Amino acid sequence: GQLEQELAALDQEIAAAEQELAALDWQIQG
Amino acid sequence: GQLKQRRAALKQRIAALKQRRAALKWQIQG
């Protein structure tokens, strides 16, 4: 419960960061 | 460039988040 809830937030944060990372990848190339 | 700096900082945050995630999984397993 508690630990799975913490994991859910971590994976949400990782997903959001991976999304921005891919966006910056394109932006750096133009 | 500015974008390249934000990308590097973002990659470090992802690495930190993934390490926290891995440590949490170890806590869940024991």
Distance from C-alpha of B17 to C-alpha of B25, rounded to nearest angstrom:
12
- PDB experimental method: X-ray
* Identity at B22, one-letter amino acid code: A
Shortest Cα distance, chain A CAs vs residue B10, angstroms: 7
What sections of A1-30 are H helices per DSSP? Answer: 2-28
- The neighbour count for residue A21, using CB atoms within 10 Å, is 15
Contacts of B17 in chain A (CB under 8 A): 10, 13-14, 17
Contacts of A29 in chain B (CB under 8 A): none
Distance from C-alpha of A17 to C-alpha of B20, rounded to nearest angstrom:
14
Q: Which 8-state DSSP code applies to residue B15?
A: H
- Tokens for B12? 């470090």
Domain positions in chain B are 1-30
Reported structure resolution in angstroms: 1.7
- The neighbour count for residue B16, using CB atoms within 10 Å, is 11
B10–A24 CB contact, under 8 Å: yes
Cβ(A11)–Cβ(B17) under 8 Å? no
From the centroid of its chain, how far is CA A2?
21
